[PDB]
Design a protein around this motif. Sequence first.
Motif, PDB file in Angstrom:
ATOM      1  N   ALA A 161      62.425  12.232  37.008  1.00 45.74           N
ATOM      2  CA  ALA A 161      63.753  12.001  36.472  1.00 45.74           C
ATOM      3  C   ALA A 161      64.465  13.323  36.271  1.00 45.74           C
ATOM      4  N   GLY A 162      63.719  14.414  36.356  1.00 45.11           N
ATOM      5  CA  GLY A 162      64.291  15.724  36.143  1.00 45.11           C
ATOM      6  C   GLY A 162      64.128  16.123  34.695  1.00 45.11           C
ATOM      7  N   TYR A 163      63.233  15.429  34.007  1.00 43.99           N
ATOM      8  CA  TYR A 163      62.936  15.665  32.594  1.00 43.99           C
ATOM      9  C   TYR A 163      61.764  16.623  32.511  1.00 43.99           C
ATOM     10  N   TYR A 164      61.757  17.418  31.458  1.00 44.80           N
ATOM     11  CA  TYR A 164      60.692  18.367  31.251  1.00 44.80           C
ATOM     12  C   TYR A 164      60.665  18.651  29.774  1.00 44.80           C
ATOM     13  N   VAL A 165      59.478  18.860  29.239  1.00 45.33           N
ATOM     14  CA  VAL A 165      59.369  19.175  27.822  1.00 45.33           C
ATOM     15  C   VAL A 165      58.031  19.852  27.589  1.00 45.33           C
ATOM     16  N   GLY A 166      57.905  20.527  26.443  1.00 48.29           N
ATOM     17  CA  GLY A 166      56.673  21.218  26.102  1.00 48.29           C
ATOM     18  C   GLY A 166      55.835  20.351  25.190  1.00 48.29           C
ATOM     19  N   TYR A 167      54.515  20.439  25.324  1.00 46.76           N
ATOM     20  CA  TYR A 167      53.598  19.622  24.530  1.00 46.76           C
ATOM     21  C   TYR A 167      52.534  20.397  23.737  1.00 46.76           C
ATOM     22  N   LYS A 168      52.107  19.816  22.609  1.00 39.90           N
ATOM     23  CA  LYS A 168      51.052  20.389  21.780  1.00 39.90           C
ATOM     24  C   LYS A 168      49.793  20.151  22.611  1.00 39.90           C
ATOM     25  N   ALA A 169      49.760  18.996  23.279  1.00 40.40           N
ATOM     26  CA  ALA A 169      48.693  18.600  24.197  1.00 40.40           C
ATOM     27  C   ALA A 169      49.257  17.399  24.903  1.00 40.40           C
ATOM     28  N   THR A 170      48.681  17.024  26.030  1.00 37.78           N
ATOM     29  CA  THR A 170      49.206  15.886  26.732  1.00 37.78           C
ATOM     30  C   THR A 170      48.247  15.402  27.763  1.00 37.78           C
ATOM     31  N   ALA A 171      48.593  14.273  28.344  1.00 35.24           N
ATOM     32  CA  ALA A 171      47.753  13.668  29.342  1.00 35.24           C
ATOM     33  C   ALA A 171      48.617  12.901  30.303  1.00 35.24           C
ATOM     34  N   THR A 172      48.062  12.632  31.467  1.00 38.86           N
ATOM     35  CA  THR A 172      48.816  11.952  32.467  1.00 38.86           C
ATOM     36  C   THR A 172      47.841  11.170  33.318  1.00 38.86           C
ATOM     37  N   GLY A 173      48.306  10.004  33.770  1.00 42.57           N
ATOM     38  CA  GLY A 173      47.502   9.109  34.588  1.00 42.57           C
ATOM     39  C   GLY A 173      47.717   7.655  34.193  1.00 42.57           C
ATOM     40  N   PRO A 174      47.010   6.720  34.835  1.00 38.19           N
ATOM     41  CA  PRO A 174      47.137   5.294  34.537  1.00 38.19           C
ATOM     42  C   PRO A 174      46.696   5.014  33.115  1.00 38.19           C
TER      43      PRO A 174
END
Lengths: 235, 246, 222, 204, 196, 242, 198, 117, 240
Positions: free
Chosen positions: I148-161
């Motif tokens: 979407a063109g979105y971006y942000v900083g994270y303390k921690a994060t995850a990605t996947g199903p």
Amino acid sequence: TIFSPEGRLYQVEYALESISHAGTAIGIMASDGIVLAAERKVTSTLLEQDTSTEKLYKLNDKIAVAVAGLTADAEILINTARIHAQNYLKTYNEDIPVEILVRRLSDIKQGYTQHGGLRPFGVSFIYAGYDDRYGYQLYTSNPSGNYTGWKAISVGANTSAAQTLLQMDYKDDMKVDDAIELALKTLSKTTDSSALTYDRLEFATIRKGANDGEVYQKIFKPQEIKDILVKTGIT
Amino acid sequence: YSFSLTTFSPSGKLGQIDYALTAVKQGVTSLGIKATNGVVIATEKKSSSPLAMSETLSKVSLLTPDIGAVYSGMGPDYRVLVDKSRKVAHTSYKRIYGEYPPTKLLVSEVAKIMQEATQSGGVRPFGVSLLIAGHDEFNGFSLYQVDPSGSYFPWKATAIGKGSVAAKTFLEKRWNDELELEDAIHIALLTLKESVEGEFNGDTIELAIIGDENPDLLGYTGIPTDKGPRFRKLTSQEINDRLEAL
Amino acid sequence: TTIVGVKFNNGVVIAADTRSTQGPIVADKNCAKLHRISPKIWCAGAGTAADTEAVTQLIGSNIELHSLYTSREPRVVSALQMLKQHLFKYQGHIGAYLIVAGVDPTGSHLFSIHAHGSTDVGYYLSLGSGSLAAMAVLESHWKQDLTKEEAIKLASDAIQAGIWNDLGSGSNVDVCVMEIGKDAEYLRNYLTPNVREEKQKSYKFPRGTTAVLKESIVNICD
Amino acid sequence: SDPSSINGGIVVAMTGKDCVAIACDLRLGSQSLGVSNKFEKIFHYGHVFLGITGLATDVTTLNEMFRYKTNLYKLKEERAIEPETFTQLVSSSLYERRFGPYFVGPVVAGINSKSGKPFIAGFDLIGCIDEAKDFIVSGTASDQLFGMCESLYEPNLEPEDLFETISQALLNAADRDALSGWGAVVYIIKKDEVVKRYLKMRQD
Amino acid sequence: TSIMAVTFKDGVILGADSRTTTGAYIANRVTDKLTRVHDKIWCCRSGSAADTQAIADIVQYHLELYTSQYGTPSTETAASVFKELCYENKDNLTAGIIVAGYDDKNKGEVYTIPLGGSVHKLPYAIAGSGSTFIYGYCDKNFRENMSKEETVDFIKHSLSQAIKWDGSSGGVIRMVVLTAAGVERLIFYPDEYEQL
Amino acid sequence: GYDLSNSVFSPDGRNFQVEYAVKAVENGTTSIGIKCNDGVVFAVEKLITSKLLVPQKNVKIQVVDRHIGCVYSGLIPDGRHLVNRGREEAASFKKLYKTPIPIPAFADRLGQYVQAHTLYNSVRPFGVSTIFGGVDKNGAHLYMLEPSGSYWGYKGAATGKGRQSAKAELEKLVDHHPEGLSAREAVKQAAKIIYLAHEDNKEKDFELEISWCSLSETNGLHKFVKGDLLQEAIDFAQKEIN
Amino acid sequence: MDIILGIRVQDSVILASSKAVTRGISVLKDSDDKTRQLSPHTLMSFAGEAGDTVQFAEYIQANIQLYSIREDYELSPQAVSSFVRQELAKSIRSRRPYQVNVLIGGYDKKKNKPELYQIDYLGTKVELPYGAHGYSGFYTFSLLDHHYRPDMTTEEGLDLLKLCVQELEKRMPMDFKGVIVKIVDKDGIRQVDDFQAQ
Amino acid sequence: RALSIFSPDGHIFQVEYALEAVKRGTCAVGVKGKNCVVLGCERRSTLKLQDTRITPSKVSKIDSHVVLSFSGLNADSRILIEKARVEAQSHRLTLEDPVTVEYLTRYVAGVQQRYTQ
Amino acid sequence: DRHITIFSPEGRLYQVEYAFKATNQTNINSLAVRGKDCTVVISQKKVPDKLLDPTTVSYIFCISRTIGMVVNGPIPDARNAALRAKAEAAEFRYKYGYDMPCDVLAKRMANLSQIYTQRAYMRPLGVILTFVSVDEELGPSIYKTDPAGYYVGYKATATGPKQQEITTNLENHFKKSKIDHINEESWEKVVEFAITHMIDALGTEFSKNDLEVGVATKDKFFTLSAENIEERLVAIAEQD
Ligand SMILES: [Mg+2]
Ligand SMILES: [Mg+2]
Ligand SMILES: [Mg+2]
Ligand SMILES: [Mg+2]
Ligand SMILES: [Mg+2]
Ligand SMILES: [Mg+2]
Ligand SMILES: [Mg+2]
């Protein structure tokens, strides 16, 4: 930019429709001045009308135009209008004749009509201007790129209504103070809202004061509108 | 795709423009209130997760040391719009007159950016609406709202996005032409509260004002003509200090 | 022209004279040659003045933008790299000779750029017609670990070297101190030694002395 | 061959108490041949005056250019440009042509309508700005002018006196210049009013 | 300018004076002419300060990217990049560069890119104005597969001579040692090299 | 309607046009490659539509630079196009870095190019899949690239119609010889595997084509298998074919 | 160079131009016309480099004629000249400049006054009572400065012109083969075919 | 993108439709006598309160001796007229003789045709 | 209205929305966390075909000496993003004289994505990018950007199903510890913590050939190998 089976330019026709949904702009050309009045679209108690300029624009010290349509679309044309004016002055050292400016603006519009594939400009203009060849003039151009000149005319909403009212009270030997009155009158009888109030008007005149020589364009300040409104009797 | 994607429909409507305005309507609320000696713009920091860090997202941006902008709509579209806006403030202005443009002009330039999206071939309009606040020597203070059409108009106060109508209504009642900045901030805070669903504090709110000059934020002392930027973002602490005085 | 950049124990200072000359004529008896690129990055320039001003403002602007876009304070190596790549682009034609100094997150820096696009780094440098008179002083009194005050004096004297011994320099001394923890302080006319003495007479003409042929009012308003 | 010494001409600007003055000679010539004695080199865009000396076609051009520019500026901004602003405009306008310049030497003079602080400034053919509070000179008799100015000038003069001073400065300096003279024009500018006077001088 | 790079048993060393002149004026007496284009690929710069600084900056960049994509670049490759730039733009450049690097399979390697933009791989190389004087001394005292210690001296001697005779050279002698063990910066003062 | 223009993402996030391109591939000849102990072998099935074809002439394997071998299945022309670009990409690499392009580098180059043809509706994906590789500064490499631009490294790889039969055969090799495989063996093996894979198309007589790039048999350069070495494997396959 | 002279009396503008065209060693023609009628009340005379001379004048002509049609109006002399200045001021910084000088005489029907404009190859434009280009000024200005008067009749101007031409034939080194004179007044542009003797 | 293209029946719709636009336009007529030609046209009456003084007339001078009147999109005409006037001056400037009515015609024609393909 | 990135009557961008679905096509999960002075990112490694050379299967990339990026999406679009990331990173250095800050690199990449969202001819990329590094000014970092063109900083994060599972797991840890980072001085432990909490949420055990770890410390980002992972994997089979 294509033709219909009837010989009409869709986008242009449709553009014109959009325009009719726009506030009404009225230009009444008198014997000693020209008047431009226009009804603002979508307002409020919180809208700042004082520091506003959305329908009446100065093109050159001698030419102003009233707009009915996409404000943004307008501004684009206006800028290039202001520029052609200045170019002409640089080239010849004389103010551009109203018709030349007008014809030029129109040809741009027409361009969008014949080639490119870009949507036309959803805007119609009324040009009130003066020059040493033809004196006071009033013109109009619409998305087709066509232009023509009037003694009195209007654009935007309720055109037929207004034009009919104008044709009714307009007379060749008029005077500014009267044209003002008529202009207001007409707007008042064609509005789609409660009643004409200063906060809903834009008004401007181009007069050549007898105690001088150069033409003065005066854009009415909110208060002055309110004043001109009481005198003509809209209260 | 060199032809306009925003064409006129039979009723006289610019489809993509109206849709973009719809996208704006679904965005978080943001407002701006203009006082006599200042302007305030605020919005809500809709953390899309508590794992994200709220600060790494300035929803309120500086365009010039005297003009700020906040929006409602698709953030990305705003981000790139801010860039182009800051740039044009320079190229079309500071690089020619050695000073930053006045609000209406910058506003006018941004407008121009959006209109082109409304007509250039192969693009979709910008899905955002911005409230741009600023000040300049000659015009004083001003607040402007700019729409995807390219239309822009000045306000004494306004709000856009989600609860715009309710907000505009609250503002319509509280605003008057004798407001001092602290008060507008207040009202901004009050108005903001009603559209805010969850926790309302200095880490979920973003206020910024345009007021007196801040020499402390200039970065150097010496030249006395420029006394500092008028745009100042409020700190979490400064925000709270005012919330507690509800 | 005489400009010097002197690095001290916790910052950097730069100074310059204030004389602008068209050939052998003092055009501006007090022009400023200290430019601001960013709040804490200043540079002094000599060569074609219009060029030093232009290249300055241009980069300053591009620097202001890069900052906004990266939400980071400006860095000297960036100002450096940018100036040097632009100057180099113009094969020497942009006659700008600059000493760019300033503090940033990484510390204090002092560099010099020659119009062809070459840079140098050092604890003390100088440029301009007064270059040698000033460098003479720096090469005699500079020492490692100068206090803020020692550096100002030093950079100040050096400019004086050029002021007195170089026809191309003169008038006053401008200083700009960029200390690390603090805000940059631009000391305009830190020194004013060349004041013209009171004229021996008054050349105030008695009114009507001039011969007028025609008088008229000019109209300013519209 | 030096474009800046073909047509001849000089301009000078000074500041006094709540006013500024700017004068110029009127000769237009082609080398030794006087051609016109009616070539004013001072122009104004509202309450800002620009004096330009140098190659006459460029003097003409630039004048045309700044009107154009100040005109659009007024339309967009809805107000008349200010001295300080114009100055940066002139500068940037000149540097635009850094590698094929207009051979001219501009002088700006006016009073900021808001602050009231008198203002003058000058430039070389590529935008190098000279901002001094005393006086600015340009033209073939620049050296002369400096000499006169440095001697005749003293701060805070009243309009009536500044007049004399600048006239004299201009007048005598011109008398030592071959390519200058044939008439002179002086503007005395005040916040509210501006007076323009022609001077009587040697026609040789 | 006096510069040389000598390959030895453990790798290669690059040495150079520290004087940059504009006519007879010493603009900078503490110039660093030993440039890092990569971790273990450095170059010695002789010619227009501007021309070389630029070329360097560009090679440094081309190599950073090379790395990102394909890992560590060979010295031969660093050279080819320099050559490419120098050769293709010969008409507008006055630069003679020596590229020296260290690699685990190739040990140390040295390349000289003279004015025409050609490249020559050599055991050692010398260049700069002061080089004229030491061709004899160098071709005489140079032996292959020397120890670091020996090499350091050979460079320290050759260059002190060059500085002695050429006025365009002087200041301090700087060296850079590239071996498997890493990178070492060496500096020798006038007080030492002047009397050898 | 999500399968009419290339760059279009279906509601399931798939690019249909890419997928149809795969079909064009599937309908094509079988080809394989076997990464061996110090090189790679490539082999392909050349279908002999008729006796009128001049024997051993319509070469289908191609070389890139001097050390990369390339073979593909699908729309032949699309493959040639891909190779040409490989060649241009390889040269530009040599020109600037002197060292011939490392296979991983080369692969990514082809990959990026193909991936690009699935980014705009004004282009159609490549109707081919390529198996290629060669020897470089550090070992042998075999890769396979699909129309989406996806590519990974293989121990063995196959594609085309006899694809599943072939892969099955390849899998056997990986499990029986984890040590590696001599260039000679892999050659014969490829010959076999192709003969086998040929059954999915068991109706027309074929002409085998093999090539290798071995550090010990071809000095790290790509050469075609011809003469004595080719008949040897033809018979080896003709042997274990029953 | 050739001679180009103009003098605007009270009701018209007289322009005289040498009739000779020289190419190297020989005089090719002794009856050349170095002028073009821009509009029916504006005339332009010209002198300069070989081709440039005509090529420029014809261009100006066409361009002024087209405006007269597109607009159904005749530009004022002032307008016509500013246009010409601008065209010259543009060529001075081109690839190859038009080395041309021109005088523009016109009768401004609107103002009801005669007008003479002098513009050099550089774009230097100036308005005067009488003017000339090249060396012509050097010999005649002294005479013009002496005898010129704003209220001169067309006849008085023609005599003054004559005198000027006389001086030129007396002190000027080259034979310009006489002049061709034209008057521009309210009724148009007429050629005084009587200047060989008047 | 090709707008004017052929149909299964051998027509270029856009061109054909163009004609329809002509039909909707006011009438224009010209008849030539023995030593003259007259062109008359009817004025458009959708709205009335026109300033005849200035309004773009329907008959336009291409040159001092050639005129052109039309029927159709008033806008589209202006362009044909401009290009025609410009070519009138251009012919004079290079052939030293004003255009013949035929030529002028063949020119304006060529323009229209071009816009069809 | 559903084939190019123009607006729908509801004001949505369907093609953008479908791109987000493609990000899941691979079926890999990853996560990242910030240490005291480092940053780690784990991602599952799944090599299906026996014929594949396991060593060439990765969705983790070394962008620059200091930046690492993990991609959740198809490999082609992934590499396409990598190459540009690399370039943009280099160019930044050459032109500005200091390494491109991970967050800056992210914003840049985000701006490029926004473009495909606004221009009809460009299809967005079906991938999600997580950038990590230890910024010289900001410290350990994680910035993620999407189609979407979105971006942000994270303390921690995850990605996947199985994004939400992992997220909630971590969300809990940080709500408990009160800090925005693992409180360990060595990366080895953070890696551990990471793998631990991964196992905890996905309910699966990992061998050495099923993981992919990336670490970023001051001035360098590297990917562990099987053997290095094991020492982690072993060390964990003592707490749990
Ligand atoms: Mg001195
Ligand atoms: Mg001078
Ligand atoms: Mg004189
Ligand atoms: Mg020496
Ligand atoms: Mg498969
Ligand atoms: Mg798109
Ligand atoms: Mg598209």
